[PDB]
Design a protein around this ligand. Structure first.
Ligand code: MG
Ligand code: MG
Ligand code: MG
Ligand code: MG
Lengths: 328, 328, 328, 328
């Protein structure tokens, strides 16, 4: 199969590396690769993070100074401000380079054309699939972890080797794995999840609550206990990842199995058409445009929805309960 | 009827003219009217074009400078950057004028309100209907060529006279003609063509290819030969422009005539509905809004579509083929 | 893999050939193989053409006489009269043959069963993709040109060799190419083009005109200048055939590209449905029946439509105009 | 204006006329114009009509012979056999003529392209609006009567004069009138009547009968008395033709007027849609195709319908009844 389990690490010995940002991700990658025998420098503005990184032993600079010194760079910062930074400070120095390597953690700002670097550069991609904290909690066992690879522009044929060397330098492999894919094939995923089943689930829960209350005379303090106020859900999401998704149900009763399976094979089509519509809306690039426009307006909708959701009925009752049970 | 065939040229003798931009159009217009007995000056930024115009015997200044010296101006540049230019350099120098004449080549940035000059100015329109190159290939025979005229604001009653004088000064008349119309009546046209039959044609071709392949087991190397890989279309367009649209078919076989006529009179309503929808969407001004917003966003959709189209199935086969026939 | 570029030519040395018809095709196809070192004889009715072919150095006989002498034949005449000819003069003289070869230029009269020759005959197909005139303009460069091959009935296992030898004998190869296919896979093509995008295009243009006029108060003398009275379509088709279909647009503006691409990916479904319907209506053979019937009636619909189309407002306006521009 | 009431008659004095057919129409026009000072000859096959026509004082020849002698001709025969006749006997004798005039009584076989004479000929139309018998019953009062005129092909600028002279030579004017129109504007009419209200009326009557019987227990021997077995209808049509269509109702009772007017303004749209569909089906020429094909088959549908209609229930009841009232 395409999968990869280990590779070399030499192309990054003899060069310097410039890490951008020192948030959750930037901190981890940086340290782990300082351990693997690499020269590392950071680029960031003088703020809280700035003091935190040097303090761990690093020689911290500002951003564009960390690039003139480097032949490689890691742009580990959010996808909402990464654009502006690339045009003001980076773009000129980048133009004034000969052979560079530029890395990302997400393909949003690239796959959709919001960033179009030159052809004198080797562009790559490296995307983990961990929340960011447990990654360290696992590396201390020598464990690896999974990632996604990809490339958009190679001018030396060495892009894949560079990417594998990177994935190795961060403890992801050996021990874990790394897949080959494109940028689109990662943004598509990181969005669909945030668009199809999370909101569907939330709305289904809210609807169960509303119906149980306003049509069957049920107490608000009860529904919550069953639906999500109890950690039964976590128990499900756990056995899912460990024992499997379907084999998980073997631990529950037969009635639950029957109802679940029937109603699952019964509603599979609606969710399918929904997912189709959303994925199509994304593939073309409308959602990026929508989000950028909303940014250009002042996040009005965001405000009103963040209001409505909290000022709903379920949220209030949840408040009294969580208080009554000590839950903060 | 409305049509005009020739008029005077005296109102432009005794004045100066400022031609903005020395691209395809501006170059031609200036080169021509330098011959009809007129003094001409250019305004443009110092780049490739700047060296070319002066090289041809012109005196080249900066844009704002070329206006202080002029009582007339030709704003021959794309409709995508004209706004900022007009707002920064022109607007003040124009406020500091007494009686001016401003000319365009399209009505997009005006008809839709993206430009609202003062009332101390005569605003006009002159729109050819040629690709830009053949205009020279024809003037060398002394021929004329067709144009569209219009006016948005006149404060001296001489606007139409100025417009006719201009159309004469560029060799369009006599020999060709000139029509009277508005700005809307030109943008509407220059858009509808780009919105109704070009894309319908392209999609129909693509669909014929896809169907022929994926449902009848046909070779990709064949369909192209019939549909567009052969220059049969060029002959059709030529006979259209020269002999007539319908009379053209007299040269083809009876079977083709029958099929074409029937299937045309059969599928006329659908395209009519489509065209109605699009023209209505334009008349109000939504398309301009959409385009300006996409500009403000970063042309994501443009990028993704330019990607999909090329990464299609037909394009790859056409690429394999063009290489095979020797076609570059 | 599939395509062919050159082959042998020996099977046609030691044999005679009988060319039927001396119209456009028969004229070119004959001279070239006469040059390539082949004995050639023509069969045609004694009329204008009859004098032309012999005048060029040929020995002209009558059709039935040209077959008794030949072991091979080329039936290069329209698909509307071929049936009677084959049924009256050819079939009788053909029963008393032993090893014959029969060639065509189209598969209409065969693929649809309107002709069912015997089994002692080798039936083949050769279909160029050129207007018929430029083919000779190109052969003088030693060039080749495209063709489609196919077979319906082989009683000697040598049919493909004969077809390749033929294609080589008319200058199409080497220099050009030749594809292997069936009769259907050519009739389907030569029809769909005449059924799907040509009439859709014509109707869309007509509708654009009608709408622009009768709902926005536009002048008839103007719309034409934009839509087709200018040869912009010719430039589009030329760039299509030469550089590519989509890459063609790079020479246009950005607004045009955006509108075109959007409206193309927006309507792809409707035309797909249309094309499906038409291709299905053909595959089964209904259109052939329709056309064979209309002939038995007197071409009434043909007449009425040829009338309506010409007596439309657009045609009258184009007539008033083409006069005004000197166009005959 | 737009109408004619009288005109000259000299262009037809000094010439001969060939009247084809001696049926109801031809007999009348011939007998008449033999009185207005014209030399007349007939062409027809030797049968009853031939003997009758030569008995009435004419000199009779054979059709083809009657044309060599004439410079004008009247083709007064049905529209179902005219084609073969024109193609066999007339066309050959007509190619060798110099300046001819050809007249019709209906535009069916022409307007639809089933006949396409040469260009050295003057083609015209003259269509009365009478059953054929009463025309003589009226002429003997010196009256005129209505006609329709038209032209398809004039090569001498004299057709209209010829047409008026003809309309005069038959006593239709003065006393009557003559209208200007085309061939289409005559066949369209002569068909619509036979397609829209005649069959609608018949079906409505049949339906009233069926409903009255099979849902309200009525006697078959009664309904007929009311619906059409009584001549009440004839009076309505007579008053229509004489006093007017709506003023007619003044003689009936109020209740009738109210119901009629209401249900008339209530059902106007449906019949309008029907008529639109039918007129459109005609204008293009599909009905002619249909009829010619049915002719080419054996008139099966005609037979089956002539059977069904007569073998209905209403017909059997009317047969039992008419016998009971002495009606043959
Ligand atoms: Mg995310
Ligand atoms: Mg344009
Ligand atoms: Mg063809
Ligand atoms: Mg009739």
């Amino acid at each position: 199969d395409k999968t990869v389990l280990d590779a070399n690490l030499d192309p990054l010995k003899g060069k310097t590396i410039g890490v951008i940002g020192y948030g959750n991700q930037g901190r981890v990658q940086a340290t782990i690769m300082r351990e693997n025998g690499l020269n590392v420098i950071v680029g960031n503005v003088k703020d809280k993070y700035y003091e935190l990184a040097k303090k761990e032993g690093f020689e911290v600079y500002e951003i564009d100074e960390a690039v003139r010194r480097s032949d490689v760079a890691l742009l580990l910062i959010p996808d909402e401000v990464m654009k502006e930074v690339y045009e003001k400070k980076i773009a000129p120095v980048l133009q004034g380079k000969k052979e560079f390597v530029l890395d990302f953690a997400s393909g949003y700002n690239v796959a959709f054309g919001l960033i179009r670097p030159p052809k004198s550069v080797d562009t790559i991609m490296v995307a983990p699939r961990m929340v960011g904290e447990g990654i360290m909690d696992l590396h201390k066992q020598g464990k690896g972890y999974p990632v996604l690879l990809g490339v958009k522009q190679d001018a030396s044929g060495k892009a894949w080797d560079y990417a594998k060397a990177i994935a190795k330098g961060i403890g992801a492999i050996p021990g874990g794995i790394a897949v080959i894919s494109s940028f689109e094939e990662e943004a598509l995923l990181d969005l669909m999840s945030e668009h199809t089943w999370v909101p569907i689930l939330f709305g289904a829960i809210k609807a169960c609550y509303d119906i149980a209350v306003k049509e069957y005379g049920v107490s608000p303090e009860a529904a919550l206990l069953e639906f999500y106020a109890s950690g039964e859900l976590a128990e499900i999401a756990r056995l899912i990842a460990e024992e499997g998704i379907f084999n998980q149900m073997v631990h529950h009763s037969t009635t639950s199995q029957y109802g679940t399976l029937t109603r699952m094979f019964k509603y599979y089509d609606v969710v399918r058409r929904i997912v189709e519509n959303e994925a199509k809306y994304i593939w073309d690039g409308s959602f990026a445009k929508e989000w950028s426009l909303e940014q250009q307006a002042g996040y009005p909708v965001f405000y009103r929805l963040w209001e409505l959701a909290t000022q709903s009925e379920m949220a209030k009752a949840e408040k009294e309960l969580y208080k009554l049970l000590g839950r903060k």
